[PDB]
Amino acid sequence: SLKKEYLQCQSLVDVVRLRALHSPNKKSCTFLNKELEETMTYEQLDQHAKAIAATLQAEGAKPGDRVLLLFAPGLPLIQAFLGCLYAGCIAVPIYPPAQEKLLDKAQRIVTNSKPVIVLMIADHIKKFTPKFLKIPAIALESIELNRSSSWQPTSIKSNDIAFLQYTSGSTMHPKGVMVSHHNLLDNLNKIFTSFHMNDETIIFSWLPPHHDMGLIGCILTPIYGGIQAIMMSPFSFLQNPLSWLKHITKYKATISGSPNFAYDYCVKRIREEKKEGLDLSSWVTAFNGAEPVREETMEHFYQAFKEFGFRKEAFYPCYGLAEATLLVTGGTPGSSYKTLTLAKEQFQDHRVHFADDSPGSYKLVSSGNPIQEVKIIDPDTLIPCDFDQVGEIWVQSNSVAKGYWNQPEETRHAFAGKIKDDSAIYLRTGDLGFLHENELYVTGRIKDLIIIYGKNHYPQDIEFSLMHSPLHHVLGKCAAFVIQEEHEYKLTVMCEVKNRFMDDVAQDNLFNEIFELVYENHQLEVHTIVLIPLKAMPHSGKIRRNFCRKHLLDLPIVATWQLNKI
Ligand SMILES: CCCCCCCCCCCC(=O)OP(=O)(O)OC[C@H]1O[C@@H](n2cnc3c(N)ncnc32)[C@H](O)[C@@H]1O
């Protein structure tokens, strides 16, 4: 548990200063690049932060100013994040754009947040420019540690905004969640406590470090709690899922996790023979959150790795979202997570229709107990639902964020939930679910998810990615779309292939390359890939798309790949 002197700090900045004073040589973060290891102690993080803050100050940045960070995974960008905080500037972490000229998302973020400076690694100054989208750019490599002594401390307030975190999927009109210093520490504390962390905790992570779980859970929480973080890049996991498990083994990581898909992805790609040497016994919490959590995924993963020390006990479903900083519900670590079986037909008043383990039934996994206050509320009447009745998940706590940057009206729709009639104020999540036995079961979204993929232009942009990647040389036309399938949504990609007789080796190689490309460009996961003969698609990307959708439902297929199927 955190010592009192750390609990008493009013910002993450003061926490880091204090750990740098009291345990300067304690190792904090380790970043892995292939076989290479780079490490950073509290003393080093603190010194780099000061040097970085000093530079921002010398360049004319004032408290409250936004500073953009091209978040290449690594220690430098972590240093940059703290450096912003040390200067009282609002950090704005973004995924560095996958392709040099595909900058639209970054541009929208730049226009929204209006940063005065952007920080990035030397390799990116090259790729991207000095100015980046009209914003003056500074290479992190150029900030000399000598500058540290010139840092002038600011007077940070609890309610001051520490950083913006842009939601995962509002790409056409990005929402920058405003996370205050008080928000951040409240959620870090709930994470450290709820996950039963201690002095010996070791967190391993490959997750995108610029937002939600990969930032708040896997970097800021360890730094806050005085425990080790060990990390590699998402690209590394995507290219070789096995590395996740090899690193947990070598480092004896105790806590690591991911969205649900990643457990399936290990099952799908890791062959029996390659598992030799794995020892997952140290892994006591394997958290599963950020998307719908599936029993089948976890059962599959458990049987694929139980012979290598993985315990089903370790699986930890959890629920949260950026507007609530991060963690909202979660269970007790080491406990078996619960499931419920629902009948095929549900009730129109959204009450829950349970079934015996009937023949059209389906299972929902619990995302745990409310860590933040959770109320299930009717999104139309604003009247509380009964238990075992689906309504909107409303959240209330000190972790609830301050709004969406520079968006008063959009903020009004999400952050000003009032129950009829009476008094508290709630975040409205957009999410549907029900409480049962004080466990939250998330059931879906208010917004039709097909209609939301369509709004962010995902299928269209994914088709473009495929056509503009080197994968094009072996394909014909392609189509991406979301199909709703027995209580699940699946992102489906289908491609004409030049060689209808490529072997099983080529098939698998191609499936893997397509999954990796779509994650690289969109950090989205394809659930189903369909291969078909050249010319099989009609000579509109729209009528082209709807043909693929309609005839998959009722054609010539060369091969099908399904992420969650063994
Ligand atoms: C130390 C480890 C700590 C890490 C702690 C982990 C706990 C929090 C992880 C989630 C953070 C989040 O995904 O952020 P975002 O705003 O980008 O999207 C949020 C949205 O995604 C969905 N969603 C999240 N969970 C879900 C779940 N269980 N079931 C089904 N849907 C889930 C919702 O639709 C939701 O509104």
CA 477 to chain centre: 31
* Topology of the domain comprising 447-566: GMP Synthetase; Chain A, domain 3 (3.30.300)
The 3-class SS string of 449-493 reads HHHHHHHCCHHHHHHHHHHCCHHHHHEEEEEEEEEEECCEEEEEE
All structural domains of the chain with their residue ranges: 1-446, 447-566
3-state percent breakdown (helix, strand, coil) of the chain, nearest 5: 35, 25, 35
The token duo for 407 is: 């968006």
376 contacts 391 by C-beta, under 8 angstroms: yes
Kind and range of the H or E element at 365?
Answer: strand 362-365
Please state, in angstroms and rounded to a whole number, the distance separating the CA atoms of residues 481 and 142: 44
Bridge partners of residue 532, in order along the sequence = 496
Residue 392 CB less than 6 A away from ligand 1: no
Nearest of 549, 540, 542, 556 to residue 496 by alpha carbon: 556
261 contacts 518 by C-beta, under 8 angstroms: no
Non-local CB neighbours of 206 within 8 Å, separated by 6+ positions:
231, 232, 233, 234, 236, 237, 243, 244, 258
State the CB neighbour count (10 A cutoff) for residue 276.
7
Q: Is 444 helix (H, G, I), strand (E, B) or coil?
A: strand
Please state, in angstroms and rounded to a whole number, the distance separating the CA atoms of residues 218 and 54: 26
E strands of 55-134, at which residues?
Answer: 66-70, 90-94, 117-120, 131-132
End-to-end CA distance of the chain: 41
483-505 in b/e burial notation, b at 16+ Cβ within 10 A?
A: eeeeeebbbbbbbbbeeeebeee
Residue 291 CB less than 6 A away from ligand 1: yes
391-406 in b/e burial notation, b at 16+ Cβ within 10 A?
A: bbbbbbbebbbbbbbe
Nearest of 174, 137, 191 to residue 12 by alpha carbon: 191
Residue the block writes with tokens 């698998």: 508
Residue 432 CB less than 6 A away from ligand 1: no
Residue 331 CB less than 6 A away from ligand 1: no
This structure was determined by X-ray
Q: Is 273 helix (H, G, I), strand (E, B) or coil?
A: helix
Please state, in angstroms and rounded to a whole number, the distance separating the CA atoms of residues 494 and 476: 10
Q: Is 163 helix (H, G, I), strand (E, B) or coil?
A: strand
Query: Which atom of ligand 1 sits closest to the CA of residue 323?
Result: 16
Nearest of 257, 310, 254 to residue 279 by alpha carbon: 310
Please state, in angstroms and rounded to a whole number, the distance separating the CA atoms of residues 352 and 343: 9
Amino acid (one-letter) located at 389: Q
Q: What is the biggest distance separating any 2 CA atoms in the chain, rounded to whole angstroms?
A: 70
Residue 322 CB less than 6 A away from ligand 1: yes
118 contacts 70 by C-beta, under 8 angstroms: yes
E strands of 73-141, at which residues?
Answer: 90-94, 117-120, 131-132, 135-139
Non-local CB neighbours of 3 within 8 Å, separated by 6+ positions:
none
Residue nearest to atom 21 of ligand 1 (CA): 290
Please state, in angstroms and rounded to a whole number, the distance separating the CA atoms of residues 295 and 41: 39
Nearest of 159, 195, 441 to residue 327 by alpha carbon: 195
Please state, in angstroms and rounded to a whole number, the distance separating the CA atoms of residues 344 and 265: 28
- Judged on CB neighbours under 10 Å (0-12, 13-18, 19+), 427 is buried
The token duo for 266 is: 């290990």
